[PDB]
Protein backbone atom coordinates (compact mmCIF):
# COMPACT_ATOMS: atom_id res chain seq x y z
CA UNK A 1 0.00 0.00 0.00
CA UNK A 2 1.15 3.55 -0.72
CA UNK A 3 0.82 6.56 1.59
CA UNK A 4 1.27 10.05 0.15
CA UNK A 5 2.20 12.19 3.15
CA UNK A 6 0.41 15.49 3.68
CA UNK A 7 -1.52 15.39 0.40
CA UNK A 8 -5.28 15.61 -0.06
CA UNK A 9 -6.66 12.55 -1.85
CA UNK A 10 -8.12 14.69 -4.67
CA UNK A 11 -4.67 15.88 -5.85
CA UNK A 12 -3.19 12.50 -6.82
CA UNK A 13 -9.47 1.58 -2.07
CA UNK A 14 -8.72 5.25 -1.38
CA UNK A 15 -8.67 6.50 2.22
CA UNK A 16 -8.13 10.00 3.61
CA UNK A 17 -6.25 10.14 6.92
CA UNK A 18 -4.73 12.98 8.91
CA UNK A 19 -1.28 11.74 7.86
CA UNK A 20 -2.09 11.75 4.14
CA UNK A 21 -3.73 9.78 1.35
CA UNK A 22 -3.69 5.98 1.56
CA UNK A 23 -4.01 3.79 -1.54
CA UNK A 24 -4.34 0.02 -1.52
CA UNK A 25 -5.85 -0.54 1.93
CA UNK A 26 -9.46 -0.93 3.06
CA UNK A 27 -10.80 0.78 6.17
CA UNK A 28 -12.35 -1.50 8.79
CA UNK A 29 -14.58 -0.41 11.68
CA UNK A 30 -13.06 -3.12 13.90
CA UNK A 31 -10.23 -2.32 16.30
CA UNK A 32 -7.08 -4.35 16.93
CA UNK A 33 -3.56 -3.85 18.22
CA UNK A 34 -1.24 -1.71 16.12
CA UNK A 35 0.85 -3.78 13.70
CA UNK A 36 2.26 -1.26 11.20
CA UNK A 37 1.94 2.29 12.58
CA UNK A 38 0.73 4.89 10.09
CA UNK A 39 -0.17 7.82 12.33
CA UNK A 40 -2.94 9.89 13.90
CA UNK A 41 -4.23 6.76 15.60
CA UNK A 42 -4.37 4.82 12.31
CA UNK A 43 -2.51 1.52 11.92
CA UNK A 44 -2.40 -0.98 9.06
CA UNK A 45 -2.09 -4.76 9.07
CA UNK A 46 -2.35 -7.78 6.77
CA UNK A 47 -5.10 -10.35 7.33
CA UNK A 48 -5.57 -8.19 1.80
CA UNK A 49 -4.25 -5.15 3.68
CA UNK A 50 -6.60 -3.35 6.07
CA UNK A 51 -6.34 -0.04 7.91
CA UNK A 52 -8.01 0.62 11.25
CA UNK A 53 -7.96 2.67 14.45
CA UNK A 54 -5.79 1.11 17.14
CA UNK A 55 -7.42 -0.14 20.34
CA UNK A 56 -5.95 1.07 23.62
CA UNK A 57 -6.77 -2.14 25.48
CA UNK A 58 -9.41 -4.43 26.89
CA UNK A 59 -12.24 -2.66 28.69
CA UNK A 60 -12.62 -3.40 32.40
CA UNK A 61 -15.04 -1.88 34.91
CA UNK A 62 -13.88 -2.59 38.46
CA UNK A 63 -16.86 -3.09 40.78
Amino acid sequence: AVLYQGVNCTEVNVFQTRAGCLIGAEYVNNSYECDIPIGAGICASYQSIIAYTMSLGAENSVA
Binding site: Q5, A40, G41, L56, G57, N60, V62
Partner: protein, 420 residues
Protein backbone atom coordinates in the same frame (compact mmCIF):
# COMPACT_ATOMS: atom_id res chain seq x y z
CA UNK B 1 18.32 23.12 69.95
CA UNK B 2 18.58 21.51 73.37
CA UNK B 3 19.38 18.15 74.96
CA UNK B 4 16.25 17.24 76.93
CA UNK B 5 13.66 18.96 74.70
CA UNK B 6 11.58 17.79 71.73
CA UNK B 7 9.00 19.38 69.44
CA UNK B 8 5.88 17.41 68.54
CA UNK B 9 3.29 18.40 65.91
CA UNK B 10 -0.35 18.73 66.91
CA UNK B 11 -2.03 19.34 63.53
CA UNK B 12 -1.51 18.62 59.85
CA UNK B 13 -2.14 20.04 56.39
CA UNK B 14 -2.85 18.24 53.12
CA UNK B 15 -0.96 20.00 50.33
CA UNK B 16 -1.24 19.51 46.57
CA UNK B 17 1.61 20.61 44.30
CA UNK B 18 2.25 20.51 40.56
CA UNK B 19 5.16 19.19 38.51
CA UNK B 20 5.52 19.68 34.74
CA UNK B 21 7.65 17.36 32.61
CA UNK B 22 8.17 17.41 28.83
CA UNK B 23 7.92 14.03 27.11
CA UNK B 24 8.17 14.34 23.32
CA UNK B 25 9.17 16.95 20.75
CA UNK B 26 7.92 17.61 17.23
CA UNK B 27 8.53 14.82 14.71
CA UNK B 28 10.15 16.34 11.62
CA UNK B 29 11.45 15.11 8.28
CA UNK B 30 13.62 16.66 5.58
CA UNK B 31 14.24 16.15 1.86
CA UNK B 32 17.95 16.61 1.18
CA UNK B 33 17.78 16.93 -2.61
CA UNK B 34 14.74 19.22 -2.75
CA UNK B 35 16.06 21.50 -0.01
CA UNK B 36 19.62 21.76 -1.32
CA UNK B 37 18.83 21.93 -5.04
CA UNK B 38 15.12 22.07 -5.85
CA UNK B 39 13.71 21.46 -9.32
CA UNK B 40 17.13 21.76 -10.97
CA UNK B 41 18.76 18.57 -12.26
CA UNK B 42 22.33 19.82 -12.72
CA UNK B 43 22.51 20.63 -9.01
CA UNK B 44 21.40 17.08 -8.19
CA UNK B 45 24.16 15.68 -10.41
CA UNK B 46 26.74 17.88 -8.68
CA UNK B 47 25.39 16.92 -5.24
CA UNK B 48 25.67 13.22 -6.12
CA UNK B 49 29.46 13.66 -6.03
CA UNK B 50 29.47 14.39 -2.29
CA UNK B 51 28.42 10.85 -1.36
CA UNK B 52 25.89 9.55 1.17
CA UNK B 53 25.33 12.62 3.34
CA UNK B 54 21.61 12.84 2.58
CA UNK B 55 21.12 9.19 3.54
CA UNK B 56 22.78 9.83 6.91
CA UNK B 57 20.60 12.88 7.58
CA UNK B 58 17.41 11.02 6.64
CA UNK B 59 18.35 8.05 8.83
CA UNK B 60 19.07 10.26 11.84
CA UNK B 61 15.79 12.15 11.47
CA UNK B 62 13.87 8.87 11.14
CA UNK B 63 15.52 7.60 14.32
CA UNK B 64 14.48 10.72 16.23
CA UNK B 65 10.94 10.47 14.84
CA UNK B 66 10.47 6.89 16.03
CA UNK B 67 12.11 7.71 19.38
CA UNK B 68 9.44 10.35 20.07
CA UNK B 69 6.65 7.79 19.72
CA UNK B 70 8.62 5.36 21.87
CA UNK B 71 8.91 8.02 24.58
CA UNK B 72 5.18 8.75 24.59
CA UNK B 73 4.29 5.04 24.66
CA UNK B 74 6.71 4.41 27.53
CA UNK B 75 5.38 7.32 29.59
CA UNK B 76 1.64 6.76 29.18
CA UNK B 77 0.87 3.21 27.97
CA UNK B 78 1.66 1.45 31.24
CA UNK B 79 -1.68 -0.30 31.87
CA UNK B 80 -3.12 -2.65 29.26
CA UNK B 81 -6.64 -2.57 30.75
CA UNK B 82 -8.68 0.64 30.74
CA UNK B 83 -10.78 1.22 33.85
CA UNK B 84 -14.02 3.17 34.21
CA UNK B 85 -15.10 5.07 37.31
CA UNK B 86 -18.43 4.01 38.85
CA UNK B 87 -21.45 6.13 37.89
CA UNK B 88 -22.03 7.33 41.47
CA UNK B 89 -19.18 9.76 42.19
CA UNK B 90 -19.14 9.49 45.98
CA UNK B 91 -15.83 8.65 47.67
CA UNK B 92 -16.46 9.47 51.32
CA UNK B 93 -16.34 13.25 50.90
CA UNK B 94 -13.37 13.46 48.53
CA UNK B 95 -14.51 15.31 45.46
CA UNK B 96 -12.59 14.64 42.25
CA UNK B 97 -14.59 16.63 39.71
CA UNK B 98 -11.59 18.77 38.74
CA UNK B 99 -9.56 15.80 37.46
CA UNK B 100 -12.19 13.33 36.22
CA UNK B 101 -13.24 13.51 32.55
CA UNK B 102 -16.04 15.93 31.72
CA UNK B 103 -18.74 14.31 29.54
CA UNK B 104 -20.09 17.73 28.52
CA UNK B 105 -16.94 18.67 26.61
CA UNK B 106 -16.70 17.00 23.18
CA UNK B 107 -13.00 16.27 23.79
CA UNK B 108 -13.72 14.42 27.07
CA UNK B 109 -11.03 16.27 29.03
CA UNK B 110 -10.91 17.27 32.68
CA UNK B 111 -11.16 21.00 33.50
CA UNK B 112 -7.50 21.11 34.53
CA UNK B 113 -6.53 19.31 31.32
CA UNK B 114 -8.63 21.81 29.36
CA UNK B 115 -6.87 24.71 31.08
CA UNK B 116 -3.46 23.20 30.33
CA UNK B 117 -4.46 22.68 26.69
CA UNK B 118 -5.61 26.29 26.35
CA UNK B 119 -2.59 27.79 28.13
CA UNK B 120 -0.02 26.32 25.70
CA UNK B 121 0.17 27.56 22.11
CA UNK B 122 4.67 30.70 8.19
CA UNK B 123 3.92 26.97 8.24
CA UNK B 124 3.42 26.94 4.46
CA UNK B 125 6.85 28.51 3.93
CA UNK B 126 8.53 25.71 5.90
CA UNK B 127 6.40 23.06 4.17
CA UNK B 128 7.13 24.29 0.64
CA UNK B 129 10.93 23.96 0.91
CA UNK B 130 11.16 20.24 1.70
CA UNK B 131 10.55 20.33 5.47
CA UNK B 132 7.60 18.35 6.83
CA UNK B 133 6.16 17.63 10.26
CA UNK B 134 4.68 14.24 10.98
CA UNK B 135 1.56 13.68 13.09
CA UNK B 136 2.06 11.82 16.37
CA UNK B 137 1.00 8.19 16.48
CA UNK B 138 -1.17 8.74 19.57
CA UNK B 139 -3.81 11.46 19.33
CA UNK B 140 -4.68 13.70 22.27
CA UNK B 141 -7.93 11.80 22.87
CA UNK B 142 -6.02 8.54 23.35
CA UNK B 143 -3.63 10.22 25.80
CA UNK B 144 -6.60 11.58 27.75
CA UNK B 145 -8.17 8.11 27.75
CA UNK B 146 -4.94 6.61 29.11
CA UNK B 147 -4.76 9.20 31.89
CA UNK B 148 -8.43 8.67 32.77
CA UNK B 149 -7.88 4.91 32.95
CA UNK B 150 -4.87 5.36 35.24
CA UNK B 151 -6.75 7.79 37.49
CA UNK B 152 -9.83 5.57 37.77
CA UNK B 153 -7.62 2.58 38.56
CA UNK B 154 -5.76 4.46 41.28
CA UNK B 155 -9.03 5.76 42.74
CA UNK B 156 -11.02 2.53 42.86
CA UNK B 157 -8.28 -0.03 43.59
CA UNK B 158 -5.47 1.85 45.34
CA UNK B 159 -2.01 0.61 44.36
CA UNK B 160 -3.10 -3.01 43.84
CA UNK B 161 -3.81 -2.60 40.12
CA UNK B 162 -0.16 -1.76 39.42
CA UNK B 163 1.21 -5.07 40.72
CA UNK B 164 -1.44 -7.50 39.47
CA UNK B 165 -5.22 -7.79 39.35
CA UNK B 166 -7.24 -4.80 40.49
CA UNK B 167 -8.82 -5.29 43.92
CA UNK B 168 -11.44 -2.80 45.06
CA UNK B 169 -11.14 -0.93 48.37
CA UNK B 170 -13.22 1.87 49.94
CA UNK B 171 -11.42 5.18 49.61
CA UNK B 172 -11.25 6.00 53.37
CA UNK B 173 -9.59 2.63 53.98
CA UNK B 174 -7.08 3.35 51.22
CA UNK B 175 -6.37 6.70 52.87
CA UNK B 176 -5.86 4.86 56.16
CA UNK B 177 -3.36 2.54 54.47
CA UNK B 178 -1.50 5.52 53.01
CA UNK B 179 -1.50 7.16 56.45
CA UNK B 180 -0.01 4.03 58.00
CA UNK B 181 2.59 4.25 55.24
CA UNK B 182 4.07 7.46 56.67
CA UNK B 183 3.92 6.42 60.33
CA UNK B 184 0.54 7.84 61.44
CA UNK B 185 -2.06 5.49 62.87
CA UNK B 186 -5.43 4.91 61.21
CA UNK B 187 -7.55 6.42 63.99
CA UNK B 188 -6.21 9.88 63.12
CA UNK B 189 -7.79 9.71 59.66
CA UNK B 190 -10.89 7.88 60.87
CA UNK B 191 -11.48 10.75 63.32
CA UNK B 192 -10.46 13.67 61.04
CA UNK B 193 -11.95 12.40 57.76
CA UNK B 194 -14.18 15.45 57.24
CA UNK B 195 -11.36 17.93 57.87
CA UNK B 196 -9.01 16.01 55.57
CA UNK B 197 -11.60 15.92 52.78
CA UNK B 198 -12.27 19.65 53.09
CA UNK B 199 -8.55 20.43 52.98
CA UNK B 200 -8.11 18.22 49.91
CA UNK B 201 -10.96 19.93 48.05
CA UNK B 202 -9.63 23.39 48.92
CA UNK B 203 -6.15 22.40 47.74
CA UNK B 204 -7.51 21.15 44.41
CA UNK B 205 -9.41 24.39 43.85
CA UNK B 206 -6.33 26.43 44.71
CA UNK B 207 -4.30 24.35 42.23
CA UNK B 208 -6.71 25.18 39.42
CA UNK B 209 -6.74 28.88 40.31
CA UNK B 210 -2.94 29.07 40.60
CA UNK B 211 -2.45 27.37 37.24
CA UNK B 212 -4.98 29.71 35.61
CA UNK B 213 -3.58 32.92 37.11
CA UNK B 214 0.12 32.42 36.29
CA UNK B 215 1.51 32.54 32.72
CA UNK B 216 5.03 31.28 33.46
CA UNK B 217 3.96 27.99 35.09
CA UNK B 218 4.17 26.01 31.82
CA UNK B 219 7.50 27.43 30.67
CA UNK B 220 9.10 24.11 29.75
CA UNK B 221 6.59 22.93 27.14
CA UNK B 222 6.41 26.40 25.61
CA UNK B 223 10.21 26.39 25.49
CA UNK B 224 10.14 23.09 23.60
CA UNK B 225 7.66 24.47 21.07
CA UNK B 226 9.62 27.71 20.67
CA UNK B 227 12.91 25.85 20.20
CA UNK B 228 11.47 23.65 17.46
CA UNK B 229 9.82 26.57 15.65
CA UNK B 230 12.92 28.77 15.88
CA UNK B 231 15.22 26.02 14.60
CA UNK B 232 12.92 25.43 11.62
CA UNK B 233 12.73 29.18 10.94
CA UNK B 234 16.52 29.51 10.97
CA UNK B 235 16.88 26.52 8.65
CA UNK B 236 14.41 28.10 6.22
CA UNK B 237 16.11 31.51 6.44
CA UNK B 238 19.47 29.95 5.56
CA UNK B 239 18.19 29.46 1.99
CA UNK B 240 18.49 33.21 1.28
CA UNK B 241 22.26 33.38 1.86
CA UNK B 242 24.53 33.98 -1.12
CA UNK B 243 27.30 31.85 0.45
CA UNK B 244 29.92 33.54 -1.73
CA UNK B 245 28.10 33.05 -5.05
CA UNK B 246 26.70 35.76 -7.31
CA UNK B 247 23.01 35.05 -6.61
CA UNK B 248 21.12 33.23 -3.87
CA UNK B 249 18.62 31.72 -6.35
CA UNK B 250 19.73 28.74 -8.42
CA UNK B 251 17.52 29.48 -11.43
CA UNK B 252 19.17 32.83 -12.18
CA UNK B 253 22.65 31.29 -11.96
CA UNK B 254 21.54 28.51 -14.31
CA UNK B 255 19.94 30.90 -16.81
CA UNK B 256 22.64 33.60 -16.66
CA UNK B 257 25.99 31.78 -16.89
CA UNK B 258 27.83 29.03 -18.79
CA UNK B 259 28.13 25.50 -17.35
CA UNK B 260 31.89 25.72 -16.61
CA UNK B 261 31.28 28.56 -14.11
CA UNK B 262 27.71 27.65 -13.19
CA UNK B 263 29.25 24.49 -11.73
CA UNK B 264 31.44 26.60 -9.43
CA UNK B 265 28.50 28.73 -8.31
CA UNK B 266 26.33 25.69 -7.57
CA UNK B 267 29.32 24.17 -5.76
CA UNK B 268 29.40 27.13 -3.37
CA UNK B 269 25.63 26.99 -2.82
CA UNK B 270 25.71 23.21 -2.30
CA UNK B 271 28.46 23.33 0.31
CA UNK B 272 26.74 26.15 2.21
CA UNK B 273 23.39 24.37 2.33
CA UNK B 274 25.05 21.07 3.29
CA UNK B 275 26.72 22.79 6.25
CA UNK B 276 23.38 24.28 7.32
CA UNK B 277 21.64 20.90 7.14
CA UNK B 278 24.38 19.17 9.13
CA UNK B 279 24.21 21.81 11.86
CA UNK B 280 20.43 21.43 12.10
CA UNK B 281 20.69 17.64 12.33
CA UNK B 282 23.30 17.79 15.10
CA UNK B 283 21.25 20.23 17.18
CA UNK B 284 18.16 18.05 16.74
CA UNK B 285 20.11 14.98 17.90
CA UNK B 286 21.30 16.70 21.08
CA UNK B 287 17.83 18.04 21.90
CA UNK B 288 16.35 14.59 21.29
CA UNK B 289 18.80 13.06 23.76
CA UNK B 290 17.84 15.61 26.42
CA UNK B 291 14.12 15.06 25.79
CA UNK B 292 14.61 11.30 26.05
CA UNK B 293 16.25 11.75 29.45
CA UNK B 294 13.29 13.87 30.58
CA UNK B 295 10.84 11.26 29.27
CA UNK B 296 12.61 8.48 31.18
CA UNK B 297 12.38 10.57 34.35
CA UNK B 298 8.67 11.12 33.72
CA UNK B 299 8.10 7.40 33.20
CA UNK B 300 9.88 6.60 36.47
CA UNK B 301 7.80 9.21 38.29
CA UNK B 302 4.58 7.77 36.85
CA UNK B 303 5.57 4.24 37.85
CA UNK B 304 6.62 5.11 41.40
CA UNK B 305 4.46 8.03 42.59
CA UNK B 306 1.17 7.18 40.84
CA UNK B 307 1.13 3.37 40.88
CA UNK B 308 2.32 3.28 44.50
CA UNK B 309 3.48 5.22 47.53
CA UNK B 310 7.08 6.46 47.51
CA UNK B 311 9.43 6.64 50.49
CA UNK B 312 12.02 8.69 48.59
CA UNK B 313 12.38 12.24 49.90
CA UNK B 314 11.23 15.06 47.59
CA UNK B 315 10.81 12.64 44.68
CA UNK B 316 7.02 13.00 44.56
CA UNK B 317 6.51 16.42 46.12
CA UNK B 318 7.55 18.35 49.21
CA UNK B 319 6.55 16.66 52.46
CA UNK B 320 5.52 13.10 53.22
CA UNK B 321 4.09 11.63 50.03
CA UNK B 322 0.49 10.42 50.08
CA UNK B 323 -0.46 9.91 46.42
CA UNK B 324 -0.40 11.49 42.96
CA UNK B 325 -2.58 12.18 39.92
CA UNK B 326 -1.52 12.40 36.25
CA UNK B 327 -2.76 14.88 33.67
CA UNK B 328 -1.85 15.25 30.00
CA UNK B 329 -0.49 18.45 28.46
CA UNK B 330 0.75 19.37 24.98
CA UNK B 331 4.09 17.56 24.67
CA UNK B 332 4.22 16.60 28.34
CA UNK B 333 2.68 15.45 31.59
CA UNK B 334 1.61 17.25 34.77
CA UNK B 335 1.70 15.48 38.14
CA UNK B 336 -0.47 16.59 41.06
CA UNK B 337 1.30 15.39 44.21
CA UNK B 338 -0.85 15.10 47.35
CA UNK B 339 1.34 15.16 50.47
CA UNK B 340 1.05 15.49 54.25
CA UNK B 341 2.73 18.35 56.14
CA UNK B 342 2.90 18.66 59.96
CA UNK B 343 1.95 21.93 61.61
CA UNK B 344 1.35 23.55 65.01
CA UNK B 345 4.32 22.06 66.85
CA UNK B 346 4.69 22.22 70.62
CA UNK B 347 7.51 22.02 73.17
CA UNK B 348 7.95 18.93 75.34
CA UNK B 349 10.53 17.49 77.72
CA UNK B 350 11.87 14.07 76.72
CA UNK B 351 13.98 11.25 78.14
CA UNK B 352 15.62 8.26 76.43
CA UNK B 353 14.35 5.60 78.86
CA UNK B 354 12.29 5.16 82.03
CA UNK B 355 13.79 3.56 85.14
CA UNK B 356 11.41 1.42 87.20
CA UNK B 357 12.29 -1.23 89.80
CA UNK B 358 15.88 -1.15 88.58
CA UNK B 359 14.82 -1.91 84.99
CA UNK B 360 15.07 0.32 81.92
CA UNK B 361 11.99 0.66 79.71
CA UNK B 362 12.22 1.89 76.11
CA UNK B 363 9.30 2.80 73.82
CA UNK B 364 8.15 0.29 71.24
CA UNK B 365 7.11 2.67 68.45
CA UNK B 366 6.75 6.10 70.07
CA UNK B 367 8.68 8.56 72.23
CA UNK B 368 8.59 9.65 75.87
CA UNK B 369 7.28 13.17 76.43
CA UNK B 370 6.47 15.23 79.48
CA UNK B 371 4.06 18.13 79.95
CA UNK B 372 5.71 19.17 83.20
CA UNK B 373 4.47 16.78 85.85
CA UNK B 374 3.51 13.52 84.10
CA UNK B 375 5.11 11.31 81.46
CA UNK B 376 3.46 9.88 78.36
CA UNK B 377 4.27 7.95 75.18
CA UNK B 378 3.33 9.52 71.85
CA UNK B 379 3.77 8.92 68.16
CA UNK B 380 6.58 10.88 66.54
CA UNK B 381 4.51 12.55 63.80
CA UNK B 382 1.38 13.39 65.82
CA UNK B 383 0.77 14.29 69.46
CA UNK B 384 -1.35 11.64 71.19
CA UNK B 385 -0.42 11.15 74.84
CA UNK B 386 -0.89 7.74 76.41
CA UNK B 387 -0.25 6.16 79.80
CA UNK B 388 3.03 4.26 80.03
CA UNK B 389 2.29 0.55 80.38
CA UNK B 390 4.07 -2.73 79.62
CA UNK B 391 2.28 -2.98 76.26
CA UNK B 392 4.03 -0.01 74.63
CA UNK B 393 7.43 -0.39 76.35
CA UNK B 394 10.08 -3.11 76.42
CA UNK B 395 12.73 -3.85 79.05
CA UNK B 396 16.47 -4.18 78.46
CA UNK B 397 19.07 -4.12 81.23
CA UNK B 398 19.30 -1.95 84.34
CA UNK B 399 19.12 1.80 84.94
CA UNK B 400 22.82 2.70 85.18
CA UNK B 401 24.10 1.98 81.65
CA UNK B 402 22.12 4.63 79.77
CA UNK B 403 22.65 8.39 80.10
CA UNK B 404 19.71 10.63 80.95
CA UNK B 405 17.38 8.00 82.40
CA UNK B 406 14.39 9.41 84.30
CA UNK B 407 12.52 7.93 87.25
CA UNK B 408 8.81 7.17 86.82
CA UNK B 409 6.27 4.44 87.46
CA UNK B 410 5.15 2.01 84.76
CA UNK B 411 1.51 0.97 84.90
CA UNK B 412 0.67 -2.73 84.67
CA UNK B 413 -2.55 -3.42 82.71
CA UNK B 414 -2.95 -6.81 84.43
CA UNK B 415 -2.67 -5.30 87.92
CA UNK B 416 -6.38 -4.38 88.34
CA UNK B 417 -7.26 -7.67 86.64
CA UNK B 418 -5.53 -9.99 89.09
CA UNK B 419 -6.17 -7.61 92.00
CA UNK B 420 -9.95 -7.73 91.49
Amino acid sequence: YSNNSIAIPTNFTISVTTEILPVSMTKTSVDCTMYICGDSTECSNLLLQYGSFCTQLKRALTGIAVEQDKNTQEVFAQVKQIYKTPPIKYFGGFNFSQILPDPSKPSKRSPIEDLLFNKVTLICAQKFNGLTVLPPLLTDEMIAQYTSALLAGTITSGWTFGAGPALQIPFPMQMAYRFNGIGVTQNVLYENQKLIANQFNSAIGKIQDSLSSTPSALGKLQDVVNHNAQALNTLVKQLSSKFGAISSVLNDILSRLDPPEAEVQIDRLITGRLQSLQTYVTQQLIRAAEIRASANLAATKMSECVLGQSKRVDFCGKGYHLMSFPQSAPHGVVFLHVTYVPAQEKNFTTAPAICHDGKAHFPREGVFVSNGTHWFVTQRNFYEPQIITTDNTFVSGNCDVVIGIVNNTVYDPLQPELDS
